[model samples]
Target: ATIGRISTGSKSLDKLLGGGIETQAITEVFGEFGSGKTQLAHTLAVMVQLPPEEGGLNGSVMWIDTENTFRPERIREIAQNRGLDPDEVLKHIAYARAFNSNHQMLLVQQAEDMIKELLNTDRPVKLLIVDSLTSHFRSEYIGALAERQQKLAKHLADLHRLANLYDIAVFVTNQVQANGGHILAHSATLRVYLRKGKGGKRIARLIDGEAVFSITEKGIED
Candidate 1:
């Protein structure tokens, strides 16, 4: 319910999002493979480092990488495009590769300590990114639908707790049509469905409206 917003690094896209990604809420972005989900996450990693007036929280980031999609090179490129020092940009971000579903959950729990530590510091951790949040959960629980759904519920609950308790933004990437109905639909404060557009552009469809953006080497653009 708070009013903090993080810029998505795209003007039109930010306008479509009512300023940008809302703080103290879970903003889920889903789509098919190569639909620019991961790219957006990378852009935000740099954007979040900017001062609040420039659409950032001037805080650090905690990235729970589940699909090995967290690329330092891309972060460097986006940072450079934004005139930020790549090394400093990467330094403020805390990265952890979740090897499996269990590990993913553990990482979320572990994040709390780090968040607390940074809370009063110059770079408080204000953003938590779970790229491809359900990859391991989807694959590991292949035939156990009931168990999978149950675990997903708990995991989402934990994520919600972190968002609310810390007043930070939780950005999750997911696959279209497979995001565990209701569980995700109800939890994600703002949901955007992304799809590929012509000429290397991408479309973000939300319940309220839609936006078109492009993915350049630098990052997301209008």
Candidate 2:
């Protein structure tokens, strides 16, 4: 159960995932504001830095912040709670804010350098997280899914290779679409749809099945 998966830092979410987020693949999660998207992103930033037996890949994280959702406080919170060094955890994260679609793509493209270097060092990068993966492209290439299909797929292909080449996990946060048919569906290995639920609870509907969880001050609780 622990094999071929990366922890989301949520027991219930992991249970729903049959352990954790699968490696060598891209995981696309969609939800609106307050859906705990960034919380999970931050939690995993630290969780993936943990030792292997503690439910991590025992590697670093590259958090490509396209929507400016990257925050220092939350990562510190997650790190402190995990008994991880705040400074050490911060060191394990490589962050970049993208100004546009092209800039974002280049950021992901340039990730190979960092990943390559880490692999030779003590910490090898194992997670590449892009929160709101389509924000810039969604705005820059505003149109129907058909119009953006090939372009989006091409953009995703680069990151997909990095995920596979480095044996890492590519996790992208997204905005939920009604149809569930779009560019991300083609590129992402799995799609997890989330929505805010009653009484601070949240809903997660995955490609395989469904799950219910909640957003907490600490992080997502399933």
Candidate 3:
């Protein structure tokens, strides 16, 4: 079916992902705190609103915020910085607050309904971002690691279904742990591990455990 491309809002990043995030696939970006994960998400939130010719889907963005970290002002600032219409870009992004793991699951279950309501008569959303997909599940099910993994798997499966069913690109950010295992040693079609680089810089590396990107003025870039 040739699903569309997922733009990281950074030309360098797009090239790293073989031109862009693959549509119909789950692209997972994980990192420690202050690693620019949320920044990249917000940048994409605005970039996805662009027309296809400008390296965008010209479609809306569905943002499932779990940590209450979504800031409209930040989005507007990035949009304006990128020469995009702040209001227009903001309008194209649909935000939903997920208070807990259960609420997050419910939102995933009723995604279609909520999306329809937001779009009304507009085109379908082309991108979905779950900023920090593992926080609630990790916190809520603390000490219940097995249950947490199961719930996480279910949520990811739902995301995969949505991506395939609607032919959209999905990006999820995850929090890293010192389990000492490999990154993405789990699901996700594409996995990126981000960490704090020397000199307080932020670096994003691929699952091979190597640095692939650095935090830049424009966001995550190679």
Candidate 4:
């Protein structure tokens, strides 16, 4: 059996990622504030709409907005810049606001129902984005560290299942801390650590001894 592949929105980044985000894998991108993590997520919202020949599944994007950072207009602009029909691209994305971690998990659980209702046609949901997966856990379960980790594990597992069952790509954004080793080194199939460079530029480094990527306007540059 073949494992699934996922797209990083940039051809160079996808090449470095071994031909894309692992299909049906829970890929995570981690970085601090202003590290272009969310930017990549937004870019992928457009990238995933490209035809497979263009290194995408020609499918729709499902964005779970935990921090209220999802901007459809921004994605449309990027799409237009890439010479794609912005309106057509915008029509392919679906957004959901996740108020908290529990609510986020609940929404993930309703993935099938949501997709069925939204698409209503034969088209499939090709990608799922969880922007900043750590914030809700960090803020809501601060004192309960162990419980927080447990909850995180459960949430990640559920996401993994969702990817496999639906045969879609899962792109997750995560926040980074000063953990001794890489923060997401162990859990994610693909992990990229991002930091702020001089002059407010963002740089992404590979961590967890796996695939790494750099941030670029064209999307995760290699």
Candidate 5:
């Protein structure tokens, strides 16, 4: 619980991820819209700041928001509910909005630069989240399958390499791949497929099995 883990403030999810999100590689979750992708991102960004006793790493977060999906208010709400100061919690997260695929790719490099600065500080950043990883690539590279895949493969590889180099956990959310691309898919070290569930819940099916969580007023629930 005190080493190599970051939580989402949910017991079931922590256990489902074998204690919590590992701080070694890329973890990608894919689903259709309304399937709890961004909810998990916001939740984790908050949870990573908790002390290890509360199943967190006692660290900070770097969130790269693609598709304009990050909401500070939602994160503030989650922070308040988690017994943290809303503004203080907001301060711990360094957030950036990505405009398009190329800009999105460049932002990761910028993130690497920011990480250098954080590392020199007292509390180093520990987790990185890239929300909706595929939209820009899909839009920009339409009908050019080979070229699209090649560029995307390199893009994901750089991100993956950063995860290892910095000794941090990376969690990315993706849209449903339209049947022809596995370039981005295969680059991930771990994958969790999400789907809608009964009663406004969401189901995350991993290689192990299935688990359900609810998206509540505060955030994701067990």
Candidate 6:
């Protein structure tokens, strides 16, 4: 039952995830600053461009840059180290920056429109990355807890529909506090609590288990 998952570019993390990033589902990774959350996102952006047998969907990516963390230079390095054409891999990933909380919500719909255009093409958009999904809402929605949750719930619902309807994997990064309590947990089928380990290693804690990986120049490694 091959489900066309995208690899995290780390063997141990893939095994801990029961494969890799699941399509038609949301994978949420929460951690403190410099805990390797964005690094994992960068790694998967290139991984999704590879063939299925190589732990990819052989598709493209739609990245909603919330905090300006979508780095093309990093993607170039990862693709080059993996022996893929850097320029070709870079071209497939469509990047857009969301300037504010409301703008971020709007970009998801824009992504849906782009997805519609690519559905019948050679490189369908199979991955959607919202790096630091909560920074904007957390900062902007300071009125009350109830209000923030209500707004975020609506945004997550849109992501949920896009993932299930189009068979795309949604990967979101969040601050540990921005876990948004149960609302975020329920929407994401796979949740990994990330933290730093000793000797330049990072630990990814799953519901039942955990994996230790490292962030290298090439990308994530075991």
Error of 5 at 85 (Å): 0.8
lDDT of 5 by residue, 1-222 (tens): 123788766666667777778887788888877788899888888888888888667677898887777889998899888888889878989988889888889989998988788876756778989887878888888889788887788888888877888777899988874564363556787788888977787887664256777876557778
Residue-wise C-alpha lDDT for candidate 2, range 77-151, written one tens digit per residue: 878878788899898899998888788889988898999988877788889999878887777766665656656
RMSD of 6: 2.0
Tens digits of per-residue lDDT, candidate 1, 1-222, equal 466789999988899888889878889998888899999999989998999888898879999999888999999999999878999999999999999999999999999999999988989888999997888888898889889888888998998898888878899998765454432556678788888988888999884267998998668988
Ranking by lDDT: 1, 6, 5, 2, 3, 4
lDDT of each: 0.88, 0.78, 0.76, 0.74, 0.80, 0.88
Which TM-score value belongs to model 6?
0.95
Model 3 bad stretches (over 4 Å) = 116-122, 179-184, 199-201, 208-222
Q: Is candidate 4 or candidate 5 better by TM-score?
A: 5
Q: Using TM-score as the measure, name the better of candidate 3 and candidate 6.
A: 6
Model 3 C-alpha lDDT per residue in residues 134-155, reported as the tens digit of each score: 8888789877877877888888
For all candidates, the clash counts are 0, 0, 0, 3, 0, 0
For model 4, the run of ten residues with the poorest summed lDDT: 208-217
lDDT of 6 by residue, 46-162 (tens): 999989888888889999988888889999999998778999999999999999989999999999999999998989999999997888988897767788888899999999899
Which of the two candidates, 2 or 3, achieves a greater TM-score against the reference? 2
RMSD per model, one decimal: 1.9, 2.4, 2.6, 3.0, 2.2, 2.0
Off by over 4 Å in 4: 1-6, 116-122, 178-185, 199-201, 209-222
Error of 2 at 97 (Å): 0.5
For each candidate in turn, the TM-score is 0.95, 0.91, 0.87, 0.85, 0.92, 0.95
Candidate 1 weakest ten by summed lDDT: 176-185
Model 1 ranges with Cα > 4 A deviation: 177-183
What is the model-wide C-alpha lDDT for candidate 3? 0.76
| Per-residue lDDT of 109 in model 3 | 74
Off by over 4 Å in 5: 1-3, 177-183
Per-residue error at 101 for model 2, in Å?
Answer: 0.5
